[PDB]
Amino acid sequence: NIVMTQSPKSMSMSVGERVTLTCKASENVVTYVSWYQQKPEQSPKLLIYGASNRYTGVPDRFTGSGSATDFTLTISSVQAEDLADYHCGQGYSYPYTFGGGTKLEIKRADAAPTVSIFPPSSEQLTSGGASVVCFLNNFYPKDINVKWKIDGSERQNGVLNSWTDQDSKDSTYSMSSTLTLTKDEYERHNSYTCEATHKTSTSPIVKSFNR
Amino acid sequence: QVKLQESGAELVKPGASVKLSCKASGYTFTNYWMHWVKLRPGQGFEWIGEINPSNGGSNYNEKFKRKATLTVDKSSSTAYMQLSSLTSEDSAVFYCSIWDSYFDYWGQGTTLTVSSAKTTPPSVYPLAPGSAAQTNSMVTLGCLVKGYFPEPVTVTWNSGSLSSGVHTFPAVLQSDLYTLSSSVTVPSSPWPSETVTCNVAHPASSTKVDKKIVPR
């Protein structure tokens, strides 16, 4: 079976730049190669067929090239919307096969997170549980740290973090951190603190409520 | 509109079989081969096989030989893929799609979970700051969708209307149960002088839930 391999595994480029994605086939596939673009929370979309044929509708900045065993997708001027996983596949011989994908991200100006904190709902509190939630929204770069404090003391167990994919409009990231405790640990403290560490500030961004 | 409709989700016991459906409309069903593909997170696509709706003619990936069988129903204009002897290796998103150079189209994909575990509806908790006027010119509201199985859930705000400034975070599995949250950001001119309501569906449990965000 023909094996397809893409490079790079991942990268980030600035809007406007030229980007080059490569795809190697373990044996000759002439020009029977397609490129698919799979944006976050979406189904894949055909960009290029027959190695170099722009699918109807595709913006001109996307040009496919190559033959035999080596193939290239070039984006002449990346746009923030071009954020995505790009896949290449050969349709020369059965079974049809695909590379492992290239994750393209967009570089943008550093951006500080909007931090917002939420106490447990009375609904949850009635069940025995208490989740405290903190949204750190639309920042860049992706690297961020969250720290939870209870009456001044860092809490460690019971926290769950999730990060969104990069946003196609503004190129930022968002994160959610939920601290979960029992009802009767929660009531037994007053001050709840969400503490964000990001390269945009030398001091952490703190958000906090009492009660 | 050209459409290839697949069920959102399917939960199935390991060792059992399942019939994935892909229901076609908007074009002449019998004039295009239907391709089935498998997608696991952080993997590339795997091609399962293809079937000609005109006659039922098929081509399979040898790898899926004992695993997948492709059929078609011309009167329902529906393609089906049967998966047998299911194992955890089978849990993945499955897509049907048409691969023509002048006509390339993909279903939404069905999320297959094979698990002995029983289905658990989500708890959904409104996230209010709350109070008022804090802070900047807009407000961030949210919903915590907790303790469910299996994936997926779908979260909308004001039934789709509010698509601006929504962030829905990827579910995380914490102990045989998933949790996710979603936040929305709106000018304080709307809220709370308007309904802001998160809508949550859990296909597997047929759960539908609306939680209005109430101040404080």
Numbering used by the authors:
A (entry chain B): 1 to 211
B (entry chain A): 0 to 215
What does the paper say about this structure?
In the present study, we generated a mAb, named G196, against glutathione S-transferase (GST) protein bacterially expressed using the pGEX-2T vector, and determined that the epitope of G196 corresponds to a sequence of five amino acids in the C-terminal extension of the protein encoded by pGEX-2T, and not to GST protein itself. The minimal epitope of the G196 mAb is the five amino acid sequence DLVPR. A Kd value of ~10 nM or less between the anti-tag mAb and the tag is desirable for rapid and robust purification of modest to low abundance proteins of interest, and such levels are common when the proteins are expressed at the endogenous level. It is noteworthy that the Kd between mAb G196 and the G196-tag peptide is 1.25 nM, which is comparable to or higher than the affinity of the anti-FLAG M2 mAb/FLAG-tag interaction (Kd = 3–28 nM, and typically considered high affinity). Furthermore, mAb G196 recognized G196- and GFP-tagged Atf1, as shown by immunofluorescent staining of yeast, comparable to that of a polyclonal anti-GFP antibody. These results indicate that the G196 epitope tag system is suitable for Western blotting, immunoprecipitation, ChIP, and immunofluorescence assay in both yeast and human.
The structure of G196 Fab was determined as the antigen-free form at 2.0 Å resolution using the molecular replacement method. The R and Rfree values of the final model of G196 Fab were 0.191 and 0.228, respectively. Asn31 in CDR-H1, and Asn52 and Asn55 in CDR-H2, are located at the side of the hydrophobic core and are good candidates for recognizing Asp. Leu at position 2 and Val at position 3 of the G196 epitope might be recognized in the region. In particular, Leu can bind through stacking interaction with aromatic residues, given that it can be replaced with His or Phe. Therefore, it is likely that Arg at position 5 is recognized by Tyr102 in CDR-H3 rather than by Asp104. Structural analysis of G196 complexed with the epitope peptide will allow precise elucidation of this antibody’s high affinity recognition mechanism for the epitope.
